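User: Here's a protein and a ligand (WEV). What would the complex look like?
Assistant: Let me lay out the input and then the predicted complex.
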Amino acid sequence: MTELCPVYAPFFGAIGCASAIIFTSLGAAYGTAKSGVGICATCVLRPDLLFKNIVPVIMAGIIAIYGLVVSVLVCYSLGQKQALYTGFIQLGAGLSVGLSGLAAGFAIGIVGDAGVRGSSQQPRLFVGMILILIFAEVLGLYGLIVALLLNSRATQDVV
Amino acid sequence: HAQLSSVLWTMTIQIAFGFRGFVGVFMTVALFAMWFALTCAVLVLMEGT
Amino acid sequence: MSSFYTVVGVFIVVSAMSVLFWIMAPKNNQAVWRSTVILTLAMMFLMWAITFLCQLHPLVAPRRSDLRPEF
Amino acid sequence: SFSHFLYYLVLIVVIVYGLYKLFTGHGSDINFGKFLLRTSPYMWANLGIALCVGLSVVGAAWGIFITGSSMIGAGVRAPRITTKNLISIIFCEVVAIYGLIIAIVFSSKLTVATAENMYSKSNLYTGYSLFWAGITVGASNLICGIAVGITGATAAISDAADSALFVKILVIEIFGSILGLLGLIVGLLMAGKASEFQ
Amino acid sequence: ELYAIAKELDSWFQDVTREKAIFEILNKSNYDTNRKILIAEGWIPRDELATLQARLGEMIARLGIDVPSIIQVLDTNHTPPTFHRTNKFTAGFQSICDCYGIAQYREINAGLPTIVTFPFMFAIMFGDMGHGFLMTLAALSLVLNEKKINKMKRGEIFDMAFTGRYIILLMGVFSMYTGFLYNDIFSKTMTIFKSGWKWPDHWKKGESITATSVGTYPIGLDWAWHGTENALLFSNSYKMKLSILMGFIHMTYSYFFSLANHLYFNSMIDIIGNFIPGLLFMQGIFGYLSVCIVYKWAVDWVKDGKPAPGLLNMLINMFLSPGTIDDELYPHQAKVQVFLLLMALV
Amino acid sequence: EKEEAIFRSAEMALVQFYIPQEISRDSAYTLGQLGLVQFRDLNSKVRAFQRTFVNEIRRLDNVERQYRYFYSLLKKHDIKLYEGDTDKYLDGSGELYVPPSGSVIDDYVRNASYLEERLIQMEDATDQIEVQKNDLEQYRFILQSGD
Amino acid sequence: TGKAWCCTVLSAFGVVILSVIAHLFNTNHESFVGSINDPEDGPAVAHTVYLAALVYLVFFVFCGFQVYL
Ligand SMILES: CO/C1=C\C(C)=C\[C@@H](C)[C@@H](O)[C@H](C)C/C(C)=C/C=C/[C@H](OC)[C@@H]([C@@H](C)[C@@H](O)[C@H](C)[C@@]2(O)C[C@@H](O)[C@H](C)[C@@H](C(C)C)O2)OC1=O
């Protein structure tokens, strides 16, 4: 009930922890769905590439790891009597990682679908597909990094 | 990489330390197996990719 | 304790080793040996020196509360 | 359309509420000034940082998939273009780099402030500056990433036909990246005078 | 009939493919109708020219047919092919450096510095002595057993990561080294040496305690930084400045290869117009940043009493407000900063 | 001594071969066995199907097509293909082997053509027998249905 | 026999890593029992991880014998 620690302060931390996994899971699901459509489309013609072309689905799932990591780390500083500064730090970290992971998952899904459909026809395109998928995943990595930077300040000098 | 490694250690092996007894030993074995699998899957292989 | 002169001495030792290897590098794959070993030593020293300078006179001291009073 | 009906209903409700407050003599009760003064500047700062990095990443991913789809599509017949058009993906990810840098710079200003000086002039200015500079950097990086992705898709499709097209569309792509660079410059300029919360 | 074919089809196919390849190569010859001479031009390295002459002499002796001078070296203005002799160790790195593009004739090879830089940048990003050890073991399994894997057939994912088995070995070794420099063994820390941080003599449980400096950690990050609240505030700055410094060094090393190329090709105008201006630009705008990063580490700001100058704010003010410095890193800072800005703008 | 061309590309000299047609096939064999010559396209000015050895390349392309058809027959009528002796040609290095004669290639071409004729005749006979047997099997099944 | 090799490798890595962890617990290492969040009883966790490493050693020797035959 303190001016520095309102009763609605835990709402921001809880909702940031929820969002960190919600948006990353949404992006990972979009990536997994699009890459699965691509893989199932290509495996009818080139079944030998079934296990090589699953990489987009794998890289879509790493976004979910980033969201889970941020959600786990946010719960560390969650509490009833936490400051509004800590709550908004948690919300900012959760929003950063969630939106970054959502964008990364969308990009991974689209580029992975394109790459799996274009690598069966041209095997030289697997390297390009992997490169662009890494470029899409490093965006979720950057969101993770910003979330970690915010979290490092969550419970420092807080009273 | 450092944060994922630390969080994986926290969620996989650090949990097994609290448990003791036969159930503690079984949980330690299973959790170490899961930790090693996740390591060699995402951190060594994929985060190393 | 130590100062930047420790990094200077390590740099002197690394440079001496690099020059010696350049002089005595084997004839077979001479360029490969020279480049690989010298550049490995160079970036190994560079990363170690950066890590050392970061902890020479740090502006941040390790702050924690979980440490048990026994330790 | 359900969305259009919702927007119209929201507009009608807002207008009716405003007219009801104004006519009854309580028009000043809809006070945006008190909303901005009584809102914690930590909210503005954290929302600005989060939206900066999020929208920068959204624009980077937007340009990345627009360029990558075209690169893979045109690479089926000309696989040689992927390595040469990777510069387009680099120009799409540099906006995410810009957003990350701006987020680091702004997070360097996230200091715990005392209760008495919670809503001081400097603290409120810092909150507003961080929020709006983060919004500016994020939206500019989003726009620049979309433009650079479109330009890179055109460049990949055109240099699949003839490699001489890439060296002339790279100029347009650099023009696009200049927008993100200017967005970063302006975002730094806004928060240059914004001191840490105290 | 088909089983009779199966015992000899492969040899017939190989013979027919060779017979078609030799005629496809002979198809690219300026035959003289009046004479009976097929004129063909090829790109053989100067090193094996004597070997080719000896082999053609051996062929002539085998056939016994007397012929005039069959080998005549030519000096033309064409672009010779780019051929680098690779071992089993440098083959993967050169495959990496040729996937991007093929170098010019007698151009500074990018595959020689890659051998070390690429695994070391991967190690900086990776940085783990336990995961690096796993990578080293995975690569050594291929390296020691490389004869058997060479003998046997390999898949697309197995041919890859085996042609680059030495790549993975170097990345694993360098990852182990960096993990030692990070003191990160399976996300834990090694207390090998004595920490430079001393905790207070006595404190209550749950009380925030700040360590006091006693020395410096010999090798790697201090292990007293493990689990502390401000561990991130130190490690992030350390790694950001490490990235900046090791990127500036790698960039200047790569840029000096442009000078090497220009010197080899006798392009002095290139040196004057693209190397020196760019070198001054990067050593005034970004080389200065690296020098300031190194210098700020070598100055005891608390002991000296001067405030710690924010290097990022200094870099921002170097362009957005010339001549204004909030914190003095070194004497005559503003003069040097405006001089370097003028150097870049010139 | 061979230059260790790792820092820069290997020094190259453009070499001209004055090969008479009397030993042209053997010279091409030796140059391909060496594997050290990247031949220039001296005859690029003329368009296709007009070059010096277009007919003899077409003949071997036809033989390769026939061998691919034989491989397709071996795959459809499941049969493991016996791999050839890679060590016979050394499949690399600068060593020279005794190359096949022109008469050997002519025998390969004539045998491939005649045996393709035999195989297509036998395959047509087998296909017609199989299709009529399949029709009779379907007729048997429809007669075997319940009342 | 791929499962046997995978289990052999995993169990050998278990015998190494868990034995190291239990030794560090038994010696009351700062990185393992040096925080209030970390387990208070060192020797108890050391014994538990000793038993886990013995289980992994049994698995390792069984799978190595299976691989050898
Ligand atoms: C069922 O658990 C599997 C994946 C899950 C659920 C992972 C979660 C932790 C996920 O939430 C995380 C987020 C993503 C992750 C950690 C993926 C790693 C997958 C494994 O990869 C090592 C494959 C891998 C064994 C398998 O996919 C293939 C057989 C393959 O081995 C075929 C190879 O040809 C190919 C080279 C290789 C490459 C693509 C990695 O994959 O295990 C699985 O399926």
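Summary: Chains F and A do not touch (no CB pair under 8 Å).
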